[PDB]
Design a protein around this ligand. Structure first.
Ligand SMILES: Nc1ncnc2c1ncn2[C@@H]1O[C@H](COP(=O)(O)OP(=O)(O)NP(=O)(O)O)[C@@H](O)[C@H]1O
Ligand SMILES: Nc1ncnc2c1ncn2[C@@H]1O[C@H](COP(=O)(O)OP(=O)(O)NP(=O)(O)O)[C@@H](O)[C@H]1O
Ligand SMILES: [Mg+2]
Ligand SMILES: [Mg+2]
Lengths: 383, 383
C-alpha cells in the first residue's frame, strides 16, 4: 500500500509540479488578439499545459542574466506555435556540449550536459543560487516538466564549434542518444509536441483550443518583450512583439475598456545594492469603468499574480488618497515589470513571490509625481 | 556548473516545497488568543516552519478518511507545542510495522514501512489516489519536509501488537535504526524540534515568537475541530478545541469586529455521487464594519486560501443582491468547511485548489433561505 514513485511518474500524476493535469477554470486567464488587445479567455484550460510553454519561455528570458558569471549576449527569443508544435529558441552561448562526469556515473553511460539539463530532475545551474540572482529559474525542474508532458521533444544546442541534437520522447521514457556534428552556429532550441489528449484537449486541437492557446502564448511573449534587456527582440511565429514598454502593455490591456486613456508612469528605484541595480517600471490607468483592482506583474521574467510589491504600491497610493479625499484602488489597472533580488517563490509554478514587506519600505521610493497624479485621478472619481 | 541535487539537500535550499525558508510577510496570518478570539499576527514569520506543523496536522486529519479501503476509527488528535517541541498524535491503526521489500532493496538494508513514510520522498499511500479520495495528502512528500526541517524527530507508532520508535535526526541526515517492542497500544505520533535558528528564529524562541507560533497552531487545531468527523476530539496542549461547528469558527473570527452578530447558516448539498457524499457547511456574518470580503475555507482538512468554491458562493449571492437592490461581497465574512472530491492542489503547500467552476453549477445547490437572508442583510447595508 505504501508506494515509492520516481520523479517522472510522479510528475505525470501530480498537480503539485505544474498545476492541474486537465482543464479547470483559470480565473484571470487572458490572451492577445489582433492593434493588440488583451482579452479574457472564458473557457477552461489545463494549467500544466500552459506551464510547459512558460517553463521554456522563462528559461529563454533567464539566459541573458548574469548571476556572478560571465556576461551573455542574447539578441532574440523566437517562440513558435503551429500544428500543435511549440518551440522556443534563443541565441547567446549554447548549453555546453561536454560529458557530465557525475551524471555519467549515475547513469552508467555517457551523459552530456544538455541531457542533464533536460532529463535529470533537480538539476541545472541555479541549484546554489545567490540570493541576489534575478533569474526566474531556481529548482532545476522546469525543463524536465516540459519533457514529461511531451509526446516528442527535440533539444538542439550549438556552441560555435559543435551542434548537439537529441530526441527526448514518450514523456521522458525514451531518451535517444544525441547526434553531435561540427557547427559554427550558437543557440539553444527546444521543440516539442505536448500530450494534448492526455491533458484534456482534442487531437488535433480544435479551432477554439488552437485560437485560445495561440492567444495565450502571444500575450506571454508580449509580456517578455517588456521585461528583457534592450538588446533582445521577442518574436511569436516570426513576428516581433512590439510591446517593449510598460506603457505599451498597459495600453494593450485597456484598449477595449478604456481607450485613449492617460497612462501614469513611474520608475521605482532604490539607493542601495542589490536593489539599486533593478529599477521597477510601472504604468497605470485609472478609470471608473474598471470593476476591481488588477495588476500585471512580470517579476524576474515570471508572470506573478501575488506579491508584496503590489501591496506596497496600493498602500502608498491609498495613504495619499485618504488624505486628499478627506480634505481607493478599485479603479486602478497597473503594470509592474522588473527584477527583484531576494524573492522566494511559493511553488514550482511561481504564482506567488514571498518577501518581507519592509524591503520596499526601507529601500524603494515611488516617485511623488506618479503618486500625486494617480491620487488626483482616483479622488476625482470618488467625488 | 550544472549541478544535480538530491531531494534532501534541495528541500533545505528551495522555497518551492514548503514556502520561504526565512521570515517574510504573510498577509492574512492569524492566531487564536484567549472566549476564543482570532486575531491578526502582524509580524513576519517563516512559511516553511508553519508548514512543518500543517503537514503533520493534515496527516492526522487524513487518517480517519477511507479512500476505497477499510474504515478507520480515530477518536483523538493531540497537538502539543512546548519548549519549541511540536508533536502530533492520533489513534486509529498504526503505520504498519513490517519490512518494506522494495525500499529495503533500494537501501540495501532492512527498511520498515514507517521509515518509508517518514524518510523516502515521493512515498506514501496516496501515490495512486482516486479522483474521489478526499484526503488532503497526495504527494508522498509532507512528512519528509517535516523531517528535513527538524534538528531531531521521533516517530512512534503502535499497531496493537508491537511498538516502533525511530529517531530521525539532523535534517534527515541521520536515520537511526528503529526499536521494536511488544505493545498493546495503537497510535501514530510525530515529535520534533524544528531548526528554528536556520529558519530565522531565536534559539530558544523569543517570548513573542513563542506566543505567535502557539496562537497560530491553536487556531489551526480549532479549524480541524470543525472539519473532522463527529467521533474525533482535537486537543491543543491537552485542552479540547471547542470549535466543532462552522458557527463556532465564525463567532471566533468575528468576536472583536462584530460581537453578538447574526450567523447565517447553510449546508450546501449535491444530488449525485461522489459530490452527494460530502455536504459543505457554511456560516457567514454580514457587517458594515468589515473592510473587505474574507473567507476561511477548510477543504479536505487543508486551509485553502483560493478556490472556485468561494467564487461559486460569491457569484450566487451577487446575482441576488443586484436583483434585490435594483428593485456586494465586501461586507461578508464566510466560513466554509467540508470535503470536495476531484480538486487538484497547485503546489505541495496546497494554498490553492483547482477545479472546473461548472462542477458547482451542475451539482451543488445553495439553500434559498441562506441566500435570501444574506441578500437582505447586504442590501440593508447598501441602502
Ligand atoms: N533556453 C536555454 N538557454 C540556455 N540554457 C538553458 C536554457 N533552458 C535551460 N537552460 C539550462 O538548463 C538548466 C535546466 O533548466 P530548468 O530545468 O528549467 O531549471 P532552472 O531554469 O535552473 N530552474 P526551474 O525552471 O525553477 O526549475 C538551466 O539551469 C540552464 O542552465
Ligand atoms: N499521522 C499519521 N497516521 C497514520 N498514517 C500516517 C500519518 N502520517 C503519515 N501517515 C502515512 O505516511 C504516508 C506519508 O505521509 P506524507 O509524506 O505526508 O504523504 P501524504 O500525506 O500521502 N501526501 P502529501 O502530504 O500531500 O505529501 C501517508 O501517505 C500515510 O500513509
Ligand atoms: Mg527553468
Ligand atoms: Mg501528508
Amino acid at each position: 500500500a505504501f508506494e515509492i514513485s520516481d520523479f517522472k511518474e510522479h510528475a505525470k500524476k501530480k498537480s503539485m509540479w505544474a498545476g492541474a493535469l486537465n482543464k479547470v477554470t483559470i480565473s484571470g486567464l487572458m490572451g492577445v488578439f489582433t492593434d493588440l488587445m488583451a482579452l479574457p479567455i472564458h473557457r477552461d484550460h489545463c494549467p500544466a499545459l500552459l506551464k510547459i510553454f512558460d517553463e521554456l519561455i522563462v528559461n529563454a528570458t533567464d539566459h541573458e542574466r548574469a548571476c556572478h558569471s560571465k556576461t551573455k549576449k542574447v539578441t532574440y527569443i523566437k517562440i513558435s506555435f503551429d500544428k500543435g508544435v511549440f518551440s522556443c529558441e534563443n541565441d547567446g552561448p549554447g548549453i555546453p556540449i561536454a560529458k557530465h562526469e557525475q551524471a555519467s556515473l549515475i547513469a552508467k553511460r555517457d551523459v552530456y550536459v544538455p541531457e542533464v539539463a533536460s532529463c535529470f530532475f533537480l538539476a541545472g545551474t541555479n541549484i546554489n543560487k545567490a540570493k541576489d540572482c534575478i533569474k526566474g529559474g531556481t529548482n532545476g525542474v522546469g525543463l524536465k516538466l516540459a519533457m514529461v508532458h511531451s509526446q516528442w521533444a527535440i533539444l538542439t544546442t550549438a556552441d560555435g564549434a559543435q551542434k548537439y541534437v537529441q530526441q527526448i520522447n514518450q514523456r521522458l521514457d525514451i531518451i535517444e542518444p544525441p547526434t553531435i556534428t561540427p557547427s559554427r552556429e550558437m543557440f539553444t532550441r527546444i521543440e516539442l509536441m505536448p500530450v494534448y489528449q492526455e491533458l484534456g484537449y482534442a487531437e488535433p486541437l480544435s479551432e477554439t483550443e488552437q485560437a485560445d492557446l495561440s492567444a495565450w502564448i502571444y500575450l506571454r511573449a508580449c509580456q517578455c518583450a517588456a521585461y528583457v534587456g534592450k538588446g533582445t527582440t521577442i518574436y511569436y511565429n516570426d513576428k516581433p512583439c512590439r510591446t517593449g514598454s510598460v506603457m505599451a502593455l498597459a495600453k494593450m490591456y485597456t484598449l477595449l475598456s478604456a481607450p485613449n486613456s492617460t497612462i501614469h508612469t513611474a520608475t521605482i528605484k532604490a539607493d542601495a545594492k542589490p536593489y539599486s541595480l533593478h529599477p521597477l517600471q510601472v504604468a497605470a490607468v485609472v478609470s471608473p469603468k474598471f470593476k476591481k483592482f488588477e495588476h500585471v506583474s512580470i517579476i524576474n521574467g515570471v508572470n506573478c499574480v501575488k506579491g508584496e510589491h503590489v501591496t506596497f504600491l496600493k498602500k502608498t497610493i491609498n495613504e495619499m488618497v485618504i488624505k486628499k479625499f478627506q480634505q481607493s484602488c478599485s479603479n486602478i489597472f497597473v503594470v509592474i515589470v522588473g527584477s527583484i533580488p531576494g524573492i522566494e517563490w511559493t511553488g514550482q509554478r511561481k504564482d506567488e513571490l514571498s518577501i518581507a514587506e519592509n524591503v520596499f519600505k526601507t529601500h524603494y521610493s515611488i516617485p511623488s509625481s506618479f503618486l500625486t497624479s494617480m491620487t488626483r485621478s482616483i479622488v476625482d472619481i470618488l467625488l
